[PDB]
Amino acid sequence: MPGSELISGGWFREENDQWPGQAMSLRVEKVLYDAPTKFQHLTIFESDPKGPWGTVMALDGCIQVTDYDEFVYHEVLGHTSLCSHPKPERVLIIGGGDGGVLREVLRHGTVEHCDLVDIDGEVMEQSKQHFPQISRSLADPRATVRVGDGLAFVRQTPDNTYDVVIIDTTDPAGPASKLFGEAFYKDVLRILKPDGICCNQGESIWLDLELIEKMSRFIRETGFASVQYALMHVPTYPCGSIGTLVCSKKAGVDVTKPLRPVEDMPFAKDLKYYDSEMHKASFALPRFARHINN
Amino acid sequence: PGSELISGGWFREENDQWPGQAMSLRVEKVLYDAPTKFQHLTIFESDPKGPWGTVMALDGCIQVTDYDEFVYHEVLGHTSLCSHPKPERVLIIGGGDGGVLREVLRHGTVEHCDLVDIDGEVMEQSKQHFPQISRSLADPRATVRVGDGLAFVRQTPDNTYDVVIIDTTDPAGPASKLFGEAFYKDVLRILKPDGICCNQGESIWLDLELIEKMSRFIRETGFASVQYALMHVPTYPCGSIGTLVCSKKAGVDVTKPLRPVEDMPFAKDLKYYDSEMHKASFALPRFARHINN
Ligand SMILES: C[S@@H](CCCN)C[C@H]1O[C@@H](n2cnc3c(N)ncnc32)[C@H](O)[C@@H]1O
Ligand SMILES: C[S@@H](CCCN)C[C@H]1O[C@@H](n2cnc3c(N)ncnc32)[C@H](O)[C@@H]1O
Ligand SMILES: NC1=Nc2ccccc2SC1
Ligand SMILES: NC1=Nc2ccccc2SC1
């Protein structure tokens, strides 16, 4: 849908039919990259140096990371899922080509290996070029990065492979469409070990509550014992907040209270957003959104 | 800023208070755009294809939309009065749209609320265009005055109010001195010994230095404790806004509700706030946690 025309007259305007009647705007200092890839329109620009945002990436017209606020969602998906697992040794990231979630996952010394599968090889290349603080772990020996559709990759992966699966996708318009669907989650269930955890890109409670509720229902019905939605503050996602559905394959698991608190881990002090109090607070939902958690 | 922010069928929230960014809402019809005695006030109906409904801006800053107004009004009204043991006399400085007053007046303990906003046109236009926000302005428990908040608290007795809620515009404009120490020395004085205050505490993304300065001077003026509560408001810049929730009495932990809303008859009519959201709001991202310790 959206491509180059979103930069016009000195600003980038995030106009999209997935959020009619609204658009966040950022002043453009310099366009660093702007081209169709094999799958998506990728735009990278340096924002106004008088403002805090730094370098900005958008896919299909939708802001994906900025320098200033990238840490939020990458620390919340990496730590909320791994700190809910008793011993997360093998992790899969679907999407995630900027490397941010992977960076956070590899702070855990329990992780033996993490596989990352993003459909768009140009996102990894441009993240290495323009966002080195986000992409700093893509070449780690504990990671294996492949370029491919995550729908096929989970269908091919054998049962009981992963302790945690993190699904860090673009929004549903575009190549991530089927990754918001029931067939994909049947496979995520299946490829988790019996005490596995998954979490995803759970969209906006202000814009997407119908889809978020639909997915919580079908994820429970595929066989996950518990699905709880965690909310976070991300200024450069539409309406300013994004969530993640955190799902436990096994019963008896309360993902809303950290099982292995980060504070007992050596890197808790390096984080800029997440800690155990923020983990517990993220599962408190506004009353209107409560029918995702119960 | 003023009328020039309505541009190309969009309202664009361009401001020197947040350089290089701007939230924009599509305009279906402008209903009102005029200078008041104090501020530029603009009211428009947003795109019916989107959710926002009618939108009000002052000095180019979005103040309320029909769709998300309830968040900040519930958080400031209930976080403060649910932290107080029996809040019977309340003062709202600013608040001329009536939203905070609507939430305060849910409380059966309130005997009287004074509301003092400098701009009488805000009350007039809120009655005309936001009836679900402004109904409360006519309530006989309220006395609604047009005047500056700083002069009002300077003529107010010691020990007048159980709760003071400071619902202002951002610091550029007529609210400038309401973000200053001298104003808060009066707020402390006009509170009763068990009093609570809360304010419009700006953004942890854009205004952290100011929030640090205010938290410090509020404590130094004599409040026993100051805790910042964060909330999700799409139509404030960067998507979140806070409130410094301050206790005159020592030994009070405002982060846990003292008088929980769920015991109250109107709990299930609220759209955002409950006792879990109250406790959660005091958890701050690590970059900002030093405001609360
Ligand atoms: C950039 S990341 C989100 C930003 C916060 N890290 C979203 C990634 O999802 C990938 N994506 C989209 N659809 C797919 C599929 N079908 N498979 C794998 N990866 C996908 C897309 O190429 C982005 O790099
Ligand atoms: C609209 S309300 C904020 C939006 C969410 N209820 C902010 C009010 O603060 C008033 N305001 C600004 N400065 C002052 C002073 N100095 N005194 C009282 N009220 C003030 C201003 O006229 C708005 O109506
Ligand atoms: N600004 C951001 N936008 C996103 C876009 C897509 C998926 C996740 C996010 S969170 C970071
Ligand atoms: N959209 C909103 N904007 C505000 C503007 C000024 C003060 C408080 C708020 S919170 C509601």
XYZ file of C-alpha atoms and ligand atoms in Angstrom:
657
model
C 0.000 0.000 0.000
C 2.094 3.034 1.188
C 5.532 3.735 -0.209
C 7.628 6.765 -1.128
C 4.785 9.359 -1.263
C 4.671 9.429 2.604
C 7.722 11.696 2.601
C 6.590 15.012 1.167
C 7.291 18.593 1.955
C 9.968 17.831 4.619
C 7.922 15.425 6.857
C 7.143 11.774 7.058
C 3.431 11.239 7.620
C 2.317 7.815 8.871
C -1.032 7.793 7.037
C -2.481 4.336 6.754
C -5.892 2.774 6.229
C -5.174 0.592 9.271
C -5.707 3.774 11.364
C -7.998 6.047 9.386
C -8.225 9.694 10.294
C -4.904 9.867 12.185
C -1.184 10.126 11.501
C 1.941 10.603 13.502
C 4.450 12.922 11.685
C 8.233 13.236 11.998
C 10.405 15.894 10.315
C 12.821 14.407 7.796
C 16.488 15.733 7.929
C 17.849 13.225 5.338
C 16.565 10.149 3.550
C 19.107 7.328 3.930
C 17.196 4.583 2.114
C 13.940 4.436 0.235
C 13.082 1.556 -2.068
C 10.833 -1.496 -2.647
C 12.398 -4.746 -1.383
C 11.196 -8.183 -2.555
C 8.303 -7.886 -0.080
C 7.843 -4.402 1.381
C 8.565 -0.737 0.922
C 11.517 0.086 3.149
C 12.300 3.694 4.185
C 15.103 4.846 6.464
C 15.642 8.527 7.435
C 17.451 10.769 9.831
C 14.868 12.763 11.736
C 15.109 16.414 12.955
C 18.309 16.853 14.976
C 16.361 19.410 17.150
C 14.146 16.496 18.211
C 15.099 13.276 20.141
C 14.165 10.520 17.584
C 17.312 9.939 15.638
C 17.255 7.508 12.804
C 13.784 6.054 11.792
C 12.857 2.929 9.832
C 9.418 2.351 8.256
C 8.062 -0.668 6.430
C 5.023 -0.255 4.153
C 4.674 3.265 5.563
C 4.633 2.100 9.192
C 7.276 3.206 11.668
C 9.200 0.131 12.905
C 11.996 1.532 15.186
C 13.559 4.865 16.108
C 16.746 5.284 17.937
C 15.125 6.935 20.886
C 12.441 4.518 21.886
C 13.468 1.189 20.280
C 14.457 -0.311 23.659
C 10.929 -0.491 25.001
C 9.357 -3.145 22.879
C 12.575 -5.107 22.434
C 13.146 -5.343 26.246
C 9.445 -6.131 26.958
C 9.121 -9.030 24.433
C 12.633 -10.488 25.209
C 12.447 -10.317 29.017
C 8.784 -10.778 29.725
C 8.855 -14.143 27.810
C 12.245 -15.394 28.983
C 11.790 -14.346 32.595
C 8.460 -16.439 32.511
C 10.249 -19.607 31.492
C 12.114 -21.875 33.975
C 15.125 -22.515 31.683
C 14.919 -21.023 28.207
C 17.650 -22.672 26.174
C 16.270 -22.697 22.603
C 14.443 -19.572 21.268
C 12.802 -18.804 17.883
C 12.131 -15.199 16.725
C 9.768 -14.902 13.734
C 10.336 -11.523 12.118
C 12.616 -9.358 14.182
C 15.022 -8.549 11.341
C 16.213 -5.331 12.920
C 17.841 -7.603 15.652
C 16.388 -5.819 18.681
C 14.487 -8.659 20.294
C 17.493 -10.966 19.547
C 19.833 -8.499 21.351
C 17.639 -8.729 24.437
C 17.227 -12.554 24.266
C 21.015 -13.005 24.092
C 21.551 -11.158 27.333
C 20.228 -14.402 29.012
C 22.944 -16.807 29.876
C 20.497 -19.770 29.763
C 20.065 -19.330 25.965
C 22.096 -21.915 23.979
C 20.761 -20.832 20.633
C 18.245 -18.526 19.009
C 16.929 -18.944 15.470
C 15.606 -15.798 13.690
C 13.571 -16.009 10.462
C 12.473 -12.740 8.742
C 11.007 -12.751 5.260
C 12.838 -9.569 4.205
C 16.595 -9.841 3.885
C 16.973 -6.109 3.155
C 15.687 -5.256 6.671
C 18.634 -7.085 8.264
C 21.097 -5.431 5.795
C 19.809 -1.917 6.441
C 19.610 -2.481 10.146
C 23.279 -3.468 10.119
C 24.061 -0.292 8.165
C 21.879 2.323 9.901
C 20.975 0.860 13.355
C 24.107 -0.821 14.641
C 23.038 -0.601 18.278
C 19.879 -2.601 17.426
C 21.504 -5.035 14.961
C 24.603 -5.778 17.135
C 23.643 -9.373 17.771
C 22.521 -10.574 14.321
C 26.001 -12.089 13.684
C 26.304 -13.687 17.188
C 27.429 -17.328 17.223
C 24.414 -18.184 19.357
C 22.059 -16.909 16.647
C 21.191 -18.339 13.238
C 19.473 -15.822 10.907
C 17.545 -17.077 7.919
C 15.580 -15.232 5.250
C 12.197 -16.818 4.736
C 8.508 -16.685 5.486
C 7.907 -17.565 9.145
C 4.618 -19.362 8.152
C 6.621 -21.996 6.220
C 9.409 -22.111 8.763
C 7.148 -23.082 11.661
C 5.281 -25.610 9.434
C 8.619 -27.329 8.657
C 10.014 -27.223 12.257
C 9.562 -30.468 14.230
C 7.372 -30.783 17.299
C 8.866 -29.820 20.710
C 11.840 -27.749 19.380
C 11.659 -24.475 21.207
C 11.323 -23.217 24.751
C 10.215 -19.737 23.702
C 8.797 -18.389 20.401
C 8.688 -14.620 19.926
C 6.652 -13.348 16.963
C 7.906 -9.842 16.223
C 6.009 -8.946 13.071
C 4.848 -5.933 11.073
C 1.138 -5.186 11.293
C -1.278 -7.482 9.417
C -1.405 -5.564 6.106
C 1.529 -6.930 4.142
C 3.567 -10.081 4.369
C 2.739 -10.629 8.009
C -0.993 -11.257 7.291
C -1.096 -15.021 7.867
C 1.072 -14.694 10.990
C -2.059 -13.238 12.711
C -4.048 -16.366 11.776
C -5.015 -19.659 13.395
C -3.032 -22.030 11.190
C 0.235 -20.296 12.129
C -0.581 -20.495 15.884
C -1.401 -24.270 15.602
C 2.194 -24.643 14.431
C 3.586 -22.393 17.127
C 1.891 -24.589 19.713
C 3.169 -27.679 18.153
C 6.836 -26.559 17.898
C 6.945 -25.489 21.553
C 8.157 -28.007 24.163
C 5.539 -28.946 26.812
C 6.534 -26.008 29.102
C 6.981 -23.549 26.203
C 6.058 -19.814 26.086
C 5.170 -17.615 23.191
C 4.599 -13.946 22.765
C 3.755 -11.762 19.774
C 3.277 -8.234 18.355
C -0.137 -7.632 19.921
C -1.102 -4.350 18.204
C -3.108 -1.470 19.756
C -5.937 -1.681 22.250
C -7.258 1.660 20.811
C -7.363 0.484 17.186
C -7.295 -3.282 17.067
C -9.280 -4.582 19.991
C -11.503 -6.690 17.774
C -8.511 -8.593 16.247
C -6.694 -8.780 19.581
C -9.775 -10.417 21.187
C -10.217 -12.742 18.162
C -6.592 -13.905 18.475
C -6.786 -14.451 22.293
C -9.827 -16.699 21.676
C -8.332 -18.772 18.938
C -4.937 -19.075 20.671
C -6.670 -20.565 23.803
C -8.785 -22.847 21.524
C -5.673 -24.159 19.690
C -4.518 -25.493 23.056
C -2.533 -22.845 24.914
C -3.496 -23.078 28.635
C -3.248 -19.326 29.295
C -3.084 -16.127 27.245
C -2.480 -12.771 29.021
C -1.916 -9.369 27.319
C 0.922 -7.096 28.442
C 0.755 -3.351 27.509
C 3.707 -1.053 27.002
C 4.519 2.599 26.230
C 5.896 3.086 22.719
C 5.504 6.580 21.366
C 6.145 5.620 17.698
C 3.540 2.949 17.459
C 0.083 4.318 16.495
C -1.763 5.734 19.566
C 1.379 5.279 21.734
C 0.927 1.841 23.148
C 1.521 -1.583 21.936
C 0.926 -4.951 23.555
C 1.981 -8.528 23.421
C -0.106 -11.682 24.004
C 1.988 -13.836 26.338
C 0.896 -17.414 26.051
C 1.741 -20.505 28.100
C 1.484 -23.950 26.552
C 1.264 -25.602 29.965
C -1.217 -25.018 32.675
C -0.147 -23.839 36.106
C 1.935 -20.938 34.739
C 1.327 -17.339 35.812
C 3.192 -15.309 33.207
C 2.063 -12.106 34.912
C 4.516 -12.443 37.855
C 8.176 -13.065 36.890
C 9.193 -16.645 37.450
C 12.911 -15.803 37.192
C 13.184 -12.127 38.117
C 15.593 -10.088 36.026
C 17.025 -8.450 39.157
C 18.774 -11.785 40.007
C 20.491 -11.600 36.535
C 23.704 -9.658 35.824
C 22.333 -7.406 33.109
C 19.204 -6.019 34.935
C 21.005 -2.706 35.377
C 21.740 -2.288 31.698
C 18.012 -2.191 30.778
C 16.287 1.155 30.078
C 12.638 0.136 30.486
C 11.972 -3.309 31.826
C 12.223 -4.604 35.393
C 10.051 -6.860 37.556
C 7.761 -4.028 38.681
C 7.202 -2.991 35.056
C 6.567 -6.684 34.148
C 3.787 -6.953 36.760
C 2.335 -3.561 35.960
C 2.181 -4.352 32.162
C -0.584 -6.895 32.748
C -2.953 -4.384 34.343
C -5.354 -3.440 31.487
C -7.730 -0.496 31.228
C -11.315 -1.654 31.926
C -12.327 -1.431 28.239
C -9.514 -3.780 27.254
C -9.999 -6.236 30.096
C -11.846 -8.841 27.984
C -8.550 -9.870 26.485
C -7.294 -10.972 30.184
C -10.459 -11.864 32.160
C -0.019 28.305 17.609
C -3.538 28.909 16.358
C -5.534 28.563 13.184
C -2.606 27.723 10.982
C -2.435 24.271 12.439
C -5.581 23.379 10.466
C -3.901 22.675 7.149
C -4.800 20.441 4.177
C -7.838 18.830 5.827
C -5.735 17.901 8.930
C -5.043 19.321 12.300
C -1.311 19.104 12.848
C -0.073 19.444 16.406
C 3.216 21.233 15.602
C 4.725 22.882 18.634
C 8.070 24.203 19.936
C 7.376 22.201 23.078
C 8.053 19.020 21.027
C 10.233 19.935 18.097
C 10.383 17.706 15.038
C 7.168 15.736 15.633
C 3.430 16.184 15.299
C 0.400 14.119 15.943
C -2.267 14.829 13.264
C -6.072 14.178 13.142
C -8.124 14.435 9.963
C -10.680 17.325 10.059
C -14.207 16.609 8.777
C -15.699 20.002 9.834
C -14.293 22.921 11.948
C -16.955 23.876 14.459
C -15.258 26.756 16.188
C -11.951 28.533 15.876
C -11.413 31.886 17.694
C -9.177 33.749 20.071
C -10.417 33.831 23.635
C -9.244 36.395 26.228
C -6.285 34.108 26.924
C -5.781 31.324 24.378
C -6.512 30.228 20.892
C -9.366 27.714 20.984
C -10.187 25.344 18.143
C -12.943 22.670 18.076
C -13.484 20.356 15.180
C -15.246 17.088 14.188
C -12.646 14.555 13.162
C -12.966 12.016 10.292
C -16.083 9.885 10.858
C -14.101 6.954 9.432
C -11.877 7.166 12.481
C -12.768 6.854 16.171
C -11.839 10.255 17.660
C -15.060 12.231 17.392
C -14.999 15.875 18.378
C -11.574 17.396 19.283
C -10.650 20.500 21.269
C -7.219 22.278 21.116
C -5.891 25.238 23.109
C -2.855 27.171 21.777
C -2.531 24.381 19.197
C -2.400 21.548 21.768
C -5.005 18.780 21.754
C -6.874 18.937 25.089
C -9.671 16.366 24.744
C -11.192 14.033 22.163
C -14.464 12.218 22.597
C -12.772 8.850 22.183
C -9.977 9.004 24.815
C -11.033 11.803 27.209
C -11.976 9.358 29.900
C -8.437 8.223 30.631
C -6.892 11.356 32.124
C -10.150 12.448 33.732
C -10.536 9.099 35.516
C -6.943 8.818 36.556
C -6.684 12.325 38.104
C -10.167 12.155 39.688
C -9.955 8.691 41.145
C -6.279 8.243 41.874
C -6.393 11.329 44.084
C -9.778 10.839 45.871
C -9.244 7.035 46.292
C -5.979 8.006 48.075
C -7.792 10.202 50.605
C -9.607 8.908 53.695
C -12.710 11.125 53.307
C -12.454 13.725 50.562
C -15.245 16.202 51.162
C -13.885 19.569 49.817
C -12.022 19.500 46.495
C -10.413 22.270 44.398
C -9.756 21.888 40.661
C -7.446 24.452 39.122
C -8.016 24.605 35.377
C -10.370 21.768 34.272
C -12.769 24.111 32.469
C -13.930 21.254 30.109
C -15.509 19.601 33.231
C -14.002 16.132 32.863
C -12.104 15.945 36.127
C -15.123 17.495 37.928
C -17.432 14.815 36.412
C -15.157 12.111 37.933
C -14.745 13.887 41.322
C -18.557 14.219 41.561
C -19.007 10.481 41.284
C -17.718 10.318 44.831
C -20.439 10.246 47.488
C -18.052 11.836 50.072
C -17.755 15.143 48.119
C -19.739 17.946 49.679
C -18.279 20.745 47.577
C -15.873 21.296 44.700
C -14.550 24.664 43.558
C -13.318 24.766 39.941
C -11.290 27.867 38.853
C -10.230 28.084 35.254
C -8.744 31.329 33.723
C -10.604 30.902 30.447
C -14.343 31.158 30.605
C -14.635 30.381 26.952
C -13.431 26.815 27.601
C -16.437 26.183 29.879
C -18.745 27.809 27.310
C -17.521 25.769 24.424
C -17.347 22.534 26.420
C -21.038 22.992 27.315
C -21.796 23.502 23.602
C -19.688 20.788 22.015
C -18.702 18.192 24.706
C -21.906 17.682 26.743
C -20.738 14.358 28.118
C -17.602 16.034 29.509
C -19.289 19.299 30.699
C -22.572 18.265 32.263
C -20.897 18.334 35.608
C -20.303 22.155 35.443
C -23.913 22.822 36.429
C -23.919 20.616 39.505
C -24.839 22.449 42.706
C -21.956 20.778 44.606
C -19.685 22.825 42.302
C -18.837 26.498 42.217
C -17.308 27.260 38.872
C -15.257 30.508 38.677
C -13.437 32.222 35.867
C -10.072 33.423 37.148
C -6.404 32.685 37.411
C -5.518 29.745 39.685
C -2.499 31.459 41.271
C -4.480 34.466 42.418
C -7.252 32.136 43.643
C -5.013 30.048 45.921
C -3.392 33.312 47.266
C -6.778 34.376 48.641
C -7.752 30.904 49.918
C -7.526 30.082 53.740
C -5.133 27.542 55.148
C -6.578 24.076 55.490
C -9.466 24.616 53.031
C -9.294 21.434 50.838
C -8.985 17.737 51.179
C -7.808 17.347 47.566
C -6.397 19.808 44.996
C -6.278 18.696 41.369
C -4.201 20.862 39.005
C -5.577 20.147 35.519
C -3.746 22.662 33.395
C -2.540 23.190 29.856
C 1.210 22.749 29.193
C 3.603 25.418 30.508
C 3.630 27.629 27.370
C 0.614 29.885 27.875
C -1.397 31.111 30.830
C -0.442 27.999 32.904
C 3.240 29.030 33.089
C 3.384 29.926 36.793
C 1.257 26.902 37.792
C 4.323 24.781 37.111
C 6.346 26.899 39.626
C 7.409 26.511 43.226
C 5.618 29.569 44.585
C 2.278 28.156 43.395
C 2.972 24.834 45.091
C 3.866 26.549 48.421
C 0.239 27.851 48.353
C -1.192 24.433 47.335
C 0.550 22.902 50.371
C -0.872 25.602 52.630
C -4.444 25.390 51.418
C -4.534 21.634 51.894
C -5.716 20.177 55.203
C -3.211 18.067 57.139
C -4.271 14.790 55.458
C -4.544 16.516 52.016
C -3.612 15.124 48.553
C -2.719 17.010 45.420
C -2.200 15.850 41.873
C -1.365 17.677 38.660
C -0.879 17.579 34.921
C 2.624 16.080 35.062
C 3.656 16.115 31.373
C 5.582 13.512 29.488
C 8.456 11.235 30.625
C 9.613 11.186 26.975
C 9.820 14.955 26.454
C 9.759 16.675 29.834
C 11.715 14.499 32.176
C 13.946 17.363 33.352
C 10.926 19.446 34.276
C 9.274 16.477 36.047
C 12.531 16.005 38.021
C 12.656 19.695 38.969
C 8.968 19.739 40.038
C 9.161 16.530 42.051
C 12.160 17.965 43.880
C 10.677 21.408 44.644
C 7.340 19.926 45.685
C 9.082 17.754 48.259
C 11.287 20.744 49.333
C 8.193 22.930 49.828
C 7.044 20.426 52.504
C 4.964 17.704 50.926
C 5.812 14.398 52.607
C 5.787 12.302 49.433
C 5.471 12.765 45.698
C 4.842 9.782 43.327
C 4.357 10.047 39.552
C 1.487 7.975 38.000
C 1.791 7.184 34.282
C -1.167 6.653 31.945
C -1.966 5.857 28.298
C -3.417 8.876 26.432
C -3.115 8.599 22.618
C -3.760 12.313 22.122
C -1.102 13.735 24.300
C 2.303 14.031 22.757
C 4.189 10.644 22.626
C 1.104 8.846 23.936
C 1.501 9.102 27.670
C 1.067 11.636 30.332
C 1.563 11.549 34.075
C 0.366 13.079 37.288
C 2.495 13.831 40.369
C 0.381 12.564 43.251
C 1.512 14.342 46.462
C 0.705 13.724 50.101
C 0.856 16.444 52.758
C 0.862 13.860 55.536
C 3.826 11.531 56.033
C 3.386 7.750 56.139
C 0.814 7.721 53.299
C 1.450 5.374 50.330
C -0.697 6.721 47.488
C 0.485 3.852 45.195
C -1.985 1.409 46.842
C -5.603 2.590 46.891
C -6.706 3.648 50.345
C -10.444 3.641 49.504
C -10.757 1.397 46.475
C -13.212 2.312 43.743
C -14.582 -1.223 43.498
C -16.407 -0.709 46.747
C -18.103 2.291 45.197
C -21.294 2.184 43.181
C -19.910 3.642 40.025
C -16.834 1.334 39.573
C -18.327 -0.473 36.574
C -19.181 2.705 34.671
C -15.479 3.652 34.414
C -13.712 2.904 31.142
C -10.070 2.988 32.218
C -9.380 3.230 35.931
C -9.640 0.452 38.576
C -7.500 -0.512 41.603
C -5.098 -2.681 39.456
C -4.562 0.261 36.999
C -3.973 2.527 40.027
C -1.176 0.394 41.443
C 0.249 -0.311 37.958
C 0.459 3.429 37.078
C 3.225 3.958 39.670
C 5.585 1.509 38.064
C 7.909 3.628 35.890
C 10.285 2.545 33.128
C 13.829 2.244 34.473
C 14.979 5.501 32.723
C 12.383 7.419 34.732
C 12.155 5.356 38.026
C 14.196 7.798 40.055
C 11.208 10.160 40.088
C 9.442 7.555 42.394
C 12.492 5.702 43.880
C 10.997 -4.718 11.797
S 10.198 -5.949 12.921
C 9.084 -4.905 13.973
C 9.762 -3.704 14.556
C 10.248 -3.899 16.027
N 11.396 -4.853 16.040
C 8.903 -6.743 11.884
C 9.527 -7.724 10.912
O 8.483 -8.592 10.524
C 8.962 -9.177 9.260
N 7.923 -10.022 8.628
C 6.755 -9.628 8.010
N 6.098 -10.672 7.607
C 6.874 -11.803 7.835
C 6.742 -13.172 7.585
N 5.632 -13.663 6.873
N 7.707 -13.996 7.991
C 8.775 -13.467 8.634
N 8.997 -12.192 8.916
C 7.993 -11.390 8.515
C 9.265 -7.862 8.505
O 10.049 -8.251 7.327
C 9.942 -7.023 9.591
O 11.381 -6.945 9.467
C -8.639 22.047 29.099
S -7.920 21.499 30.663
C -6.799 20.204 30.137
C -7.424 19.108 29.230
C -7.987 17.893 29.993
N -9.125 18.204 30.925
C -6.624 22.794 30.914
C -7.217 24.082 31.474
O -6.165 24.794 32.121
C -6.618 26.204 32.081
N -5.622 27.135 32.610
C -4.441 27.563 32.024
N -3.794 28.420 32.755
C -4.542 28.597 33.886
C -4.462 29.438 34.986
N -3.367 30.320 35.135
N -5.407 29.354 35.934
C -6.465 28.526 35.802
N -6.657 27.733 34.718
C -5.679 27.792 33.829
C -6.962 26.339 30.606
O -7.791 27.536 30.376
C -7.630 24.984 30.307
O -9.067 25.116 30.203
N 7.850 1.956 16.929
C 7.559 0.627 16.769
N 6.722 0.280 15.831
C 6.452 -1.107 15.666
C 6.032 -1.549 14.436
C 5.720 -2.874 14.207
C 5.852 -3.817 15.215
C 6.275 -3.362 16.452
C 6.534 -2.014 16.654
S 7.065 -1.505 18.275
C 8.251 -0.246 17.735
N -5.560 14.637 25.066
C -5.216 15.263 26.242
N -4.398 16.267 26.241
C -4.111 17.018 27.397
C -3.725 18.353 27.223
C -3.448 19.146 28.326
C -3.582 18.623 29.593
C -3.949 17.287 29.767
C -4.186 16.500 28.647
S -4.670 14.780 28.786
C -5.914 14.806 27.438
